[PDB]
Design a protein around this ligand. Sequence first.
Ligand code: BEF
Ligand code: MG
Length: 638
Amino acid sequence: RAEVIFAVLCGICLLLGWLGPKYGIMSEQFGFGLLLAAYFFGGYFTLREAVEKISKGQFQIDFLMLVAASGAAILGEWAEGAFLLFLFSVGHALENYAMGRARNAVAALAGLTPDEALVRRGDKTETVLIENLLVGDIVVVRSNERLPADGFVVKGSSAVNQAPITGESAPVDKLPVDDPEFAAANLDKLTPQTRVFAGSINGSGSLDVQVTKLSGESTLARVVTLVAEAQTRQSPTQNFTKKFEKIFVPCVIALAFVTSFSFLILDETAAQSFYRAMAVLVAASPCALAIATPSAVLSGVARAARGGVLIKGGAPLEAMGHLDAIAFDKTGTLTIGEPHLVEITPYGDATETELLQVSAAVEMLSDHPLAQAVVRDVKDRLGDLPSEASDFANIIGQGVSAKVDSKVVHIGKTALFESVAGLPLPDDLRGTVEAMSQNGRTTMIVRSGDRYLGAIGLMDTPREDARSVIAALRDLGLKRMMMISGDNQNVANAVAKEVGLDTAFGDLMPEDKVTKIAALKADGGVAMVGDGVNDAPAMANATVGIAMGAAGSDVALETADIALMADDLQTLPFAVGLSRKTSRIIRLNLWFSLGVVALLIPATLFGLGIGPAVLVHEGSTLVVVANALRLLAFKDNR
Ligand code: BEF
Ligand SMILES: [Mg+2]
C-alpha cells in the first residue's frame, strides 16, 4: 500500500491517452477517459495536502499546482493539467523516499537496564522496581546480571563489563570500599575499583552495590534522555524552499487577479484576460524545483550505498561537505578493539624467548581477556608454542599463578608481587613497568622462583587505516580534529601520537563527549564517528552522526545518520567528497529551476500560453534530472 503507483498510473494514463488518439488506434473517447484517470490518480493524494492544512493553517504550493490543473482543464483543454498532477505526484514521492530522522533508536536503549532489582531489608531481600530504589539502598547484583543502579561496591568482588559507558568491553576488576559511610559522604574520592554504573554487565561474582543516583539520574538514563531530546537537523536547501513557497504563492496570486481584471483597463476580451490569469498561474508551478531538489539526494544516496556508505537522508549528505570539524572515538573506531602484544622487556639473565615461553605456558590456561592475545602473539613471534603449565590458579583481582619446569610462576599486576610470598619487586623493574603504563601499555610482570623474568606490554593498537585517513581529511580542510575516548588517558595519548591527532581526551563519560562536541558545533559543522552507546548522545547532538557499520552497537547504527558499512575509514574522504559535488549539482539545478519559472512568468504575462508551458517545464525537468544523474559516475580516487 503506497501511492507512488498512482503516479505510475498517471504516467500510463498520460502516455497512452496522449499517444493513442494521435499516433495509435484509440478513440478520443477512450484516450480522454485515460486523461480522466490521469487526473483522478493525480488528484486524490495531492488534494489532501491543501485540504488538510487550509482547513486551519496557511497557503502552500500544493494549492497552486492542484488548482493549476483545474484551470488547464477548464480553459484551453490540453490535459496539461495531467502533466502537472503527474509531475507534482512524483515531486511528492521523490521527497518521500528522501527523509530520515535521529530520535529512532529508543527501542534498543531500554534493553540495557533491568526492570527490577533485589534490595536488602535487614534479614530479608525484597524485589523492587528501579523506579523505587532510594539512595543508600543496598542492591544485590548476582552473576552475569545487568547492574540496576549507579553506586559503589560494598560487598563482594567481581569483574564488570562497563562497555555501554566506558566503551571498553573488557571486564574491570571491582572490589568493596573500605568504609561505606566515608564513601557515601565522599563520592569524589571513589577509586574506579569501587564505582559502578547502571547497565554494566556483572561477572562471575555477586556484588552488593549501595545506590547513589536515582533511577532517573544514572549515567545511562542521561544517555537515553540526551538521545531522545536531540532535535532533527534541517536541510538548508529544504528550509530555503519552505520560505520561497510561503512567499511565492501569495505573490503569484496577485498577478492572478490583476490579469483577471486586465480587460477592464486594456483592450482584451474578458475570457482571455481570464486565460492570461490561468496562463501565469500554470506557468508559476515550479515543476523543475519539485523534481530537482530530491533527485540529487536520491542519486547521491544510492551512489554512497554502492560505495559502502549508508546514508539516512538528504540532511546528512548536505551537511557532510560543510564540516569544519570532526571528532573520533578511539575504541572500535580508530582502533580495532582488542589487545595485541606490543612490548617485551626481559630482566636480568632472562632471554626474550624464555619470557615469552613462560608467559604463553601460563596464559594457555587462563580465561582472562589478555591471555588469548598473549598466546596468539607468542605463537606468531616464535612460530610455535611451548608446553602448558601445571597447577594453574587465579589470584582474584591481581593475576595468576602456575607451575612451569618445576618452578612456581606468578604473572600479573604490580600489586600481586607486593601481596605474595616471593621476592619483592625490584625498584628498577618497577619503574620500567611504570614507564610502560605511562606509555599506555597494559603490563604484566612475570616471575619464576627466585627470578623475575621480566615484563610484557599489550595495547589496543590503532587501525593501519587511521593515520592515512586522518591526514587525508586534513587536506580536504578538516583542520579541527580531536579524539574523545572513554578509555584511560595514557592509551588515548599513545594512540593519538600514533594516529597523529594532537588533542586527545580520555577518561570521558558520555556527557563529556557531548560537551566537547558542543564546543565544536558552536564554531562550525561537526561530525561524530563512533561505535558504542557512550557515543550515541554525541552522534545525536553533533551536526552529523557516523557509526562504524560492523563493529557498531545497534544503538549507534540506529542513532547515526551515516554508517560506514565496511568499517573502512577511507570511505570518509569519499563521503565528504561526494557530498560536496552533491551540493554543487543541486546548487546549479536550483537556479535553473528558479529561472525557468522566474524568467518565464513575464514571458507568459506577455501572452504565452499553455502549449509553451508544458514544453518548457518538460525541458527543465529533464535537464535537472539528467544533471542530478551525474552523481552516479562520481569516483573514489582512492
Ligand atoms: F570507545 Be571510545 F574510545 F570511548
Ligand atoms: Mg567505542
